[PDB]
Amino acid sequence: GVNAVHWFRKGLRLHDNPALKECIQGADTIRCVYILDPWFAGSSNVGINRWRFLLQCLEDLDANLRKLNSRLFVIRGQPADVFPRLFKEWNITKLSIEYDSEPFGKERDAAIKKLATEAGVEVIVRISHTLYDLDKIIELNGGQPPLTYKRFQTLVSKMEPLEMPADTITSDVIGKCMTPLSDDHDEKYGVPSLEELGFDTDGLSSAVWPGGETEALTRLERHLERKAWVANFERPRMNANSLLASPTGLSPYLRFGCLSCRLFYFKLTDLYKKVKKNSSPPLSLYGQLLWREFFYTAATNNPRFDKMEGNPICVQIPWDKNPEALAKWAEGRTGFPWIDAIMTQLRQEGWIHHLARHAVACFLTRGDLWISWEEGMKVFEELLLDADWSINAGSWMWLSCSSFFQQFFHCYCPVGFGRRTDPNGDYIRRYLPVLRGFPAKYIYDPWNAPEGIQKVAKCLIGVNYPKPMVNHAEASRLNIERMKQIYQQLSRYR
């Protein structure tokens, strides 16, 4: 019969999946596949929390497919290796994917599309990771993506209204389409565990950010209620509680496709109309989505978007190379408790607040260590659940004054910012247990504590907790000057 395969990469959901919906139509069998390669050299920089989040998305998908009399098929290897075999073994005639705007993904998908054509397989591609056809936004701007958010906003408002989300894949939608299943499915196609990827899990705490569509859809409602409670759709002022992972947080779910950006858009729209009594919302309502769309648009036609050299939009700043200073930053042993707490939260949980990101990124790059944004990007890629190629590269260039016309950022103080955010130091004591004995007077600068205070705290600076790795006052003075000199002669660095 007509045997269809839908290939999950992002778009890890059954709601608003136009590619899956179209593939099922007119099909006699359907098999949803995810191609997992945990040992791939290109994925050697993926950390354990990202693996766990992915696996939990896959377990969620498999569970929801069970309800529809189907299963997720997890295939190990590379797509170019496995898809020729699958086409023959399953007699496939249709293959669907959600479109991938990222340069490497466009190259991969063009190769699979050629393999599918060679084997007599129809390919269905549908845009749903982003709100818009990014190529149309670029054409509206004259052929190049915009590099300012205000310009991007102007372009977005000129696009045609969003189409309605695709119907959720239910049993009624699946209809006559069935999924052939084997008694040994779990053994041959099951979702692997962390231990099957080679990871120890002994003593590992439960995920602060559980993966999956089901979780994403619950959080969507919490997110909307919080904005309804305050009748304000702008992003809120950060306080110390904002540093903690929130049950309203959506960013990892948008990154993996657990939550449709278009569903988020219409839910926001309907809530604004009800609360504000206005059919015409401001574009600020969609801020989180449009900043995301902005960096996707800037990245799609730039294969060196994640590099400095050979990147047409990036200022060529002479960053220092310092592997040992970089490692102290990445491992949260800088000796500045505010910085180490943030880097520890990041490593332990996979998410940190936007201003916390500014803080640690300023320290690494333009503020204290003068290390390339490319290196902070790589660490965030390993640890940050909501980091993807486009967002991660774009944000690291933004904050390092390397692109997007960004210049005189505030130079964050690795002591004063934390003290002003959380004067009592609860955030420090939560993520840095060894410092719990320090009073608030010294919690952000423990090297200033008298010896008697350190001894009572059972934490000797230089032994139980590191000395500060730099003199922030001198280092920031020199780096502020270096960045001033670069922008005094900016064209010299194009």
For the annotated binding site for FAD, the residues are 251, 288, 354, 386-388
Return left, alpha or beta for 274; rule: phi > 0 is left, psi -120 to 50 is alpha, else beta.
alpha
Give every strand in the sheet of 3-8, ordered side by side: 72-76, 29-36, 3-8, 92-98, 122-126
Helix H or strand E encompassing 222: helix 213-230
Torsion on CA atoms 336, 339, 345, 347, rounded to nearest 10? -100
Q: For residue 427, what are the contacts with CB-CB under 8 A and spacing of at least 6?
A: 240, 243, 341, 418, 421
Known binding residues: 251, 288, 354, 386-388
Q: For residue 423, what are the contacts with CB-CB under 8 A and spacing of at least 6?
A: 440
Gap between the Cα atoms of 299 and 171, Å rounded: 38
- Cβ(146)–Cβ(297) below 8 Å: yes
- Cβ(265)–Cβ(292) below 8 Å: no
> Closest Cα partner for 283 from 294, 298, 274?
294
Radius of gyration of the chain (CA): 24
β-pairing verdict for 3-8 and 29-36? parallel
- Cβ(57)–Cβ(10) below 8 Å: no
Say which DSSP state 178 is in: B
The number of beta carbons lying within 10 Å of the beta carbon of residue 490 is 11
Gap between the Cα atoms of 398 and 27, Å rounded: 46
Gap between the Cα atoms of 479 and 369, Å rounded: 8
- Cβ(48)–Cβ(56) below 8 Å: no
